[PDB]
Subunit: 299 residues, 3 copies
C-alpha cells in the first residue's frame, strides 16, 4: 500500500518543471530541462496513480483510516494537486488533456475540502495536537494550484476566486499554527513537515503571478518579503528538523522551493531584485537536486 505522502515527489518535480518552463525565451536549453522534468514528473505521477488505485481496491480500510484522521487526511489533497500540475505540464503538448486533468483536479480538491474540512468544524475530533503544517495542503495549496491552473486555461476571474479562497484561508490558519509550534511544537517523526511552512507565500505569489500575467507589483513584493523571512527561519531550524536523521519526508520542502524558483523567474523578467531572483532560482534547484540524489541513494 503506497504511502500517500509519496505524491509529494512528483509534485516537487512537476512544479520545478514549470519554473524552468518560464526561462525558455531567455535560455533555450531551459526548455529541455523543463521537458525532462515534466516527463519524469508525469511518469511518476502515473505510476503512483496506478498504485493508489490498487490501494483503493485492496487496502481500502487504510484509505478510510487516513481519511478520517484529523491529521493524515490532508495528504490526500496531494492527489488532486499533483493532478493539476501534471495538467499544467501537459499543456505544452496537448491543451485538451491538460484541461481535463485541471478540471478533475479542481473539482476533486473542492469536493474534498468541502466534505472533510467543514466536517472538522463539527468539533470533537480535531485536537490542539492536530494543528499540523500539513493542514495547509487541502485548505490553502489546493486553491492556489486551482487558481494558477485555471489562469493557464484563460479562466482568470474564476482563478481569482480560488486565489482569494487560498490566500484568506492561509492568513486565517497560520496564526494558530505558529502559536502551537511555539508552545508544544512537534514530535520528531513529524518534523519534516515543517517544510510545508515554507510553501504558502511562495505558492501564493506564484499563483498570483500566473493570474496577473507576470506583473510584479506591490503585493508580489510583499509576499516575497514574508516568504524569505520564513526561509531564513527554516534554514536556522534545519539541524533541529533533521535531528533524528535525514528522511524522505524532506520532500515537503520541495513544494516551497519549487515555487520560490517559479516566482523567481517572473521577478527576473520584470527586472526586480534580479540578484535575489538568481540566488533563489539557483538555491532552490540545488536543494531539490540534493533531494533527488538522496532519493535515488535510498532506492
Amino acid at each position: 500500500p503506497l504511502p500517500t505522502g509519496y505524491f509529494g515527489i512528483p509534485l516537487g518535480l512537476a512544479a520545478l518543471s514549470l519554473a524552468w518552463f518560464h526561462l525558455e525565451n531567455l535560455f533555450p536549453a531551459a526548455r529541455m530541462v523543463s521537458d525532462v522534468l515534466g516527463i519524469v514528473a508525469s511518469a511518476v505521477w502515473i505510476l503512483f496513480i496506478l498504485m493508489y488505485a490498487y490501494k483503493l481496491r485492496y487496502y481500502f480500510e487504510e484509505v478510510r483510516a487516513e481519511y478520517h484522521s484529523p491529521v493524515r487526511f490532508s495528504f490526500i489533497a496531494l492527489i488532486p494537486i499533483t493532478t493539476m500540475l501534471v495538467g499544467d505540464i501537459l499543456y505544452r503538448w496537448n491543451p485538451l488533456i491538460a484541461e481535463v486533468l485541471i478540471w478533475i483536479g479542481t473539482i476533486g480538491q473542492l469536493l474534498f475540502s468541502t466534505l472533510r474540512v467543514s466536517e472538522l468544524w463539527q468539533g470533537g475530533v480535531f485536537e490542539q495536537k492536530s494543528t499540523h503544517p500539513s493542514f495547509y495542503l487541502p485548505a490553502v495549496a489546493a486553491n492556489f494550484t486551482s487558481a494558477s491552473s485555471l489562469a493557464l486555461l484563460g479562466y482568470h476571474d474564476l482563478g481569482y476566486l480560488f486565489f482569494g479562497a487560498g490566500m484568506i484561508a492561509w492568513i486565517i490558519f497560520e496564526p494558530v499554527l505558529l502559536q502551537h509550534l511555539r508552545i508544544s511544537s512537534l514530535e520528531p517523526q513529524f518534523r519534516a513537515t515543517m517544510g510545508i511552512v515554507l510553501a504558502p507565500a511562495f505558492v501564493c505569489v506564484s499563483a498570483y503571478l500566473s493570474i496577473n500575467h507576470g506583473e510584479v507589483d506591490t503585493l508580489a513584493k510583499i509576499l516575497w518579503g514574508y516568504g524569505f523571512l520564513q526561509l531564513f527561519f527554516l534554514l536556522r531550524l534545519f539541524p533541529w528538523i533533521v535531528e533524528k536523521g535525514l528522511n524522505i519526508g524532506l520532500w515537503a520542502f520541495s513544494f516551497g522551493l519549487a515555487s520560490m524558483a517559479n516566482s523567481a523567474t517572473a521577478f527576473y523578467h520584470g527586472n526586480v531584485l534580479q540578484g535575489v531572483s538568481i540566488f533563489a532560482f539557483v538555491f532552490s534547484n540545488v536543494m531539490i537536486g540534493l533531494l533527488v540524489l538522496m532519493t535515488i541513494y535510498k532506492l
Copy 2:
C-alpha cells in the same frame, strides 16, 4: 421582554431591500420589490425599537445582564446596525432623516464597541468557551455597515476608516474562532449562529463596493472567492446545524445571504462572472424567502 436577537429579522429584510434597489435601472419592477421590503423592514424595526424601549424601562436588569455577558452582549450591536440600514432605505425618500439615523447608528456602534469590547481586553470574564460567531457583530459587521452608510452620504474617506477597522478586525478574530470550532464546537442551542460565519466576506465586499462606486476589482473578486468557500462549508454543515430542529435563529444566515445578493448586483453590472452572480442573487432570495415563510408559519 423582546429577545435582542429578533433585530436580526428587520436586518435581513433591510439588507435584502438594498440589494433589490440596485437592480432598478436593469429591471424597473425591482424598485417595487425593494420598496416593499424597505417598508416592511422599517415597520418591524420601529416596532422592535418601541419594544426595546419598553424593555429598557421595565426589564432593565435583563438588558444589564445581556450587556455584561461576554457572549450575549454582541447581539445589542444589532440595534445600531439595523438603525443604519433603515437609514439607507429611507435615503431613497428623505436624505435628512436618513443621515440622522446613520450618524446615530454609527456613533452608537462605535461607543458600544469602545466600552464593551475594550473591557473584554481587561481579562478574566471572557472565556475560551465565549468564542462565538456572534462576536463578529460588534467587532466587524457594525464597522462595515458604518462604512457603506457613510459612503452613501458622500463621506468616502471616513467610510474607508470604518471599512479598514472592520476588515482588519475580521481577519484578526476569525483564526481563533475557527480553531475553537474545530476543537469544542458549539452546543446545539448556539448552532444557528454558525450562519453569522457566512457574513464577513460578503458584508465586506458589499461595503467595499459601496465605497469604491461599484468597481469590481481584484480585492472584490478575492473576497468573493473566500465568501463562496465559506458558503460551501456551511451548506455541507447545514443538517448538523439544524440537528435539533428548525428555529428562528436561522435568521443569522440572512445577513450573509442578503449581502451576497447585494454584492451579486455589482458583479452583474460590471459583467464579471454574471452566471455566478445570477445564481447567488436567486439562491439568496429563495433562502430568505424560506426564512420568511417559516417565520410566518410560526406566527
Copy 3:
C-alpha cells in the same frame, strides 16, 4: 546595569523628530523642533549604547538571561530599531554615517529575529503566558523600521521585502495576542506594555508611506481606520492600565504615538481628513510631552 526597555525613550524621541521633519516646508519652525528632538534622541541613544556596552562587559549573565527568556528577549530588538532611527535623523546632516547605522540596524535585527524567534518555533520554552505585546518588537516593528529606513536610502524594492515581512508577521501574531488578552490578560507590572498594541497599524502605515513617496491611497486609509479603533480601545482602557500607578513603562505608548504623528503629516500633505490629521498630530505631541515631563520629574 541599564534596563533594556530604556531604549524606548530615545526611540520615541527619535520617531517624533522624524514626524516634525516632514512639516518643514509648510512650517519652517518645525525644522528647528525636529532638529532639537533629533539631537536629544541621538544624545540619549549614544549614552545608552555606551551603557549597554558596559552591560555586555560586566553584567553579561544578565544579558544572557534576558536573551534566553521567551518574554524579555524582545526588548533587545529596541537596540537595532533605535539604531536605525538615529540613522534616519542623521541623514539630514550626513548620509554616509546614516547609511552605516541603517545597515547595521537592519542586519542586526534580521540576525536577531532569525536566531531567537525561529528558536521559539522549537517548542517547550515559550508558554501561553509568554504571549505579550512586546513580541511585536522583533517580529514586526523592526521590519517596518528597516523598510522605511531602506526606503530613505533609495532601496525601495528591498524596503518592500521588509515591509511585507512586517505586515504579514503582524497579522499573523495579533489574533493569538488578542485572544490571550481577552482570556488571562496581564499582571499589572506588564500592563504598560499594552501601549505597544497601539504601534503596528501606525508604524505600518508610516513605513508604507515612506516607501510609496507619501501617496495616501486605499491601503493607508484602511490602516488608519484600524489604528484609530485600537487608539479608542486603549484610551478607554487607560485607567486600568495605570491602576497600580504611573511609571516609566508608559514610554511604550510613545512608539505608536510618534508614528501616528508621522503618518498624520502625510495625510495632511495629501489633503485627506486634514482635521483628523491635525488632531492626531497635536494629541500625540501633547501625550509624548507629558511623558517627557513625567520623566524629568522622576529624574
